[PDB]
């Protein structure tokens, strides 16, 4: 899926990780891919040139990478939905949670049903340049019943207060036990 910085200079950022068997979640540049232990904590920033219009917004959803499953939504498998995990404000069905937020929307769309979390976008901290926010995945990539071993794209878009697109990007993901060890495989 093709990046959309569009006016305000929109685009992700990741804090540098290393591949260490223990690390819980680490990020790589050359794969443009997040490899992390699942429902673990994910600090993803954002970067902008321009201060985006008060009220806008920024969400996240789920695709499968591959054209053959990219018309099927990303959802948890039925043993992770109904493992009472929840944290009374995420739907148990959806995989990507937000932590650390007091306003998170989980959404799923009247037409194509499929999930997504939007937040409020924040401009970044006092002598800080970029936003954070904090997203865990509820679902391991190997789940059967649910992503079945096929990788997803998380895209994120930074919408206005009407809902229109004002800038995109998009991370690989991949949710596994050892985050460490399949990052310098792929790699
Ligand atoms: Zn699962």
Same mark, same amino acid.
């Given at each position: 899926q093709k990046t959309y910085q569009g006016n305000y200079g929109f685009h992700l950022g990741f804090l540098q990780s290393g591949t260490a068997k223990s690390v819980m979640c680490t990020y790589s540049p050359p794969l443009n891919k997040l490899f992390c232990q699942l429902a673990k904590t994910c600090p993803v920033q954002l970067?902008?040139?321009?201060?985006?219009?008060?009220?806008?917004?920024?969400?996240?959803?789920?695709?499968?990478?591959?054209?053959?499953?990219?018309?099927?939504?990303?959802?948890?498998?039925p043993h992770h939905e109904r493992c009472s995990d929840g944290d009374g404000l995420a739907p148990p069905q959806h995989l990507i949670?937000?932590? &650390? =937020? +007091?306003?998170?929307e989980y959404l799923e769309d009247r037409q194509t049903f499929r999930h997504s979390v939007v937040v409020?976008?924040?401009?970044?901290?006092?002598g800080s340049e970029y936003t954070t926010i904090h997203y865990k995945y509820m679902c391991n990539s190997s789940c059967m019943?649910?992503?079945?071993?096929?990788?997803?794209?998380?895209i994120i878009?930074?919408?206005?207060?009407? &809902? =229109? +697109?004002?800038?995109?990007d998009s991370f690989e993901v991949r949710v596994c036990a050892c985050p460490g060890r399949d990052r310098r495989t792929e790699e």
């Open positions: 970067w902008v040139s321009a201060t985006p219009p008060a009220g806008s917004r920024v969400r996240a959803m789920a695709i499968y990478k591959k054209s053959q499953h990219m018309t099927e939504v990303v959802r948890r498998c949670r937000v932590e &650390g =937020n +007091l306003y998170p409020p976008y924040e401009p970044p901290e006092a019943g649910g992503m079945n071993r096929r990788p997803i794209l998380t878009t930074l919408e206005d207060s009407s &809902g =229109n +697109l004002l800038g995109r």
